[PDB]
Amino acid sequence: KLPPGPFPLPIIGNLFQLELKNIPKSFTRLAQRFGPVFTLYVGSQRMVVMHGYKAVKEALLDYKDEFSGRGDLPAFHAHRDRGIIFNNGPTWKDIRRFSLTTLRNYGGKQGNESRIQREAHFLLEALRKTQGQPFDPTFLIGCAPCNVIADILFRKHFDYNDEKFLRLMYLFNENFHLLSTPWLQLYNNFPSFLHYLPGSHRKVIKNVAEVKEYVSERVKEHHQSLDPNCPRDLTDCLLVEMEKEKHSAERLYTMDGITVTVADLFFAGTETTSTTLRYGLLILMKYPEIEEKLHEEIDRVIGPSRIPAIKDRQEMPYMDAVVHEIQRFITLVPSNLPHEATRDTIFRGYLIPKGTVVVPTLDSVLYDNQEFPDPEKFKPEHFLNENGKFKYSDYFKPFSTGKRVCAGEGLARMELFLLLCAILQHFNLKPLVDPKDIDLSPIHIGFGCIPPRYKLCVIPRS
Ligand code: HEM
Ligand SMILES: c1ccc2[nH]ncc2c1
């Protein structure tokens, strides 16, 4: 007994029920019609969508092992079943677990804060270097989290002007962008009919292969000078783990597997944080009054010169709330990443067969209209008690939750606080249009929500 849903058509299933430019909106439309759990056929493939905190929470937390699979994403077939993001195989569990331990060992530790704090040095330099002229913040702000993850992964630090640096960011940006477009949405559910026609899916595929090749080469480089006594980074810690298991019959790690793990952490480690920061700057420019309040709190708690520290969050409730509100407001990965039933499952009273794609929607949660009155409006007080202290919400789920929760959550959240603190400590944001004319709406919705392209100026405070 499948969850209720619209009557599918031959070949295309439910494609008339879906607006490809705005799948999250189609999902919301379908939840009004059929309730919090529903069935869809997108092409021949069956999915069940959960919509709203209760349904999304049950799916991700009560049936953790049942939905701990990962739905196929054809554009990233080069990663499928290797690493962590795109694998629905036996190898997922211990590669994930090991990566998380290594990530954590590399930073509570204060290695993460320090690492972020020292990148803020280079980020702040680049912004001063624009000397108050208009600039596209895309490939400037983006260097910050990209270097931070490069330190952990490769022991590698890049100049902001360096050629392969800018190119890797370009490809990350292009992929996140194109994956959020309607042609790619159609491609991921009809890959066999469409794969060999021309179109943007081919750019994504080429792009994925280029990043993988760049990673691959850094990995083999790491092999050729690996000191098993003295691992330099996460890429090393994975090499060490592969060669402890030389004699083993069953292999957890391959050289292909590790490059995928690294290519994963490199892409995810860079793109979502950069997009978040970039969106956050555009929002703060739409509400001059919010930036002002931020400036006074930074001047009061930290002052004009002392490098922001994580221990400042407790004492900066307005900043803390704004940072949460940026992530809640932009719903950056608004349908989550797709899950799948590892087993024939009984959810509520419905059968969800093995290998049904399961979509525990995140925007439906982050935009709950009772948890967050006026959820469509940007409001720091969505995360502030009436007496002005930071207010926690169980609805703040932008990193998802459960078995497949974002592997970089700790890092990302630290980065957003400390980098946004740093930027506002030293700079005023200057929009090139009137704050009233700024349209905050995503220009593409799919895999992510993509901000409009814009230029701005930053005007030094110190
Ligand atoms: C603002 C920044 C970020 C946001 C909004 C974000 C969001 C997400 C979401 C929604 C998922 C899917 C979870 C699920 O399937 O239930 C995910 C997974 C993942 N993230 Fe993030 N993320 C961010 C930053 C990062 C960073 C910095 C890293 C690198 C350490 C990272 C690495 C990963 C990996 C490897 C996965 C796949 C988890 C798995 O499939 O087992 N992410 N993220
Ligand atoms: C793709 C791009 C950015 C990401 N952050 N977390 C998972 C992820 C995947």
Side-chain angles (χ1 to χ4, degrees), residues 7 21 28 50 53 55 85-88 107 120 156 161 175 246 258 313 342 348 350 368 394 402 407 426 429 450 460:
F7 302 130
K21 302 206 82 83
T28 294
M50 281 81 261
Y53 174 85
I85 310 182
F86 305 91
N87 74 321
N88 196 44
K156 197 159 179 68
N161 293 155
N175 285 340
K246 286 163 70 185
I258 283 160
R313 194 171 226 146
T342 51
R348 311 228 153 155
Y350 302 117
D368 189 277
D394 202 44
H426 292 276
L429 318 164
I450 307 311

Side-chain angles (χ1 to χ4, degrees), residues 116 120 123 144-145 277 414-424:
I116 287 151
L123 181 57
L277 279 166
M414 189 177 303
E415 287 187 355
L416 298 171
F417 172 79
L418 295 184
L419 271 23
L420 192 46
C421 265
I423 291 161
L424 296 170

Side-chain angles (χ1 to χ4, degrees), residues 85 176 267-268 271-272 337 406 447:
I85 310 182
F176 201 69
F267 178 36
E271 204 39 37
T272 32
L337 276 38
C406 176
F447 188 97

Side-chain angles (χ1 to χ4, degrees), residues 276-290:
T276 307
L277 279 166
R278 186 164 86 244
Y279 231 139
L281 259 30
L282 184 70
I283 300 173
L284 291 185
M285 287 194 276
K286 182 157 181 72
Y287 310 100
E289 291 211 82
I290 296 179

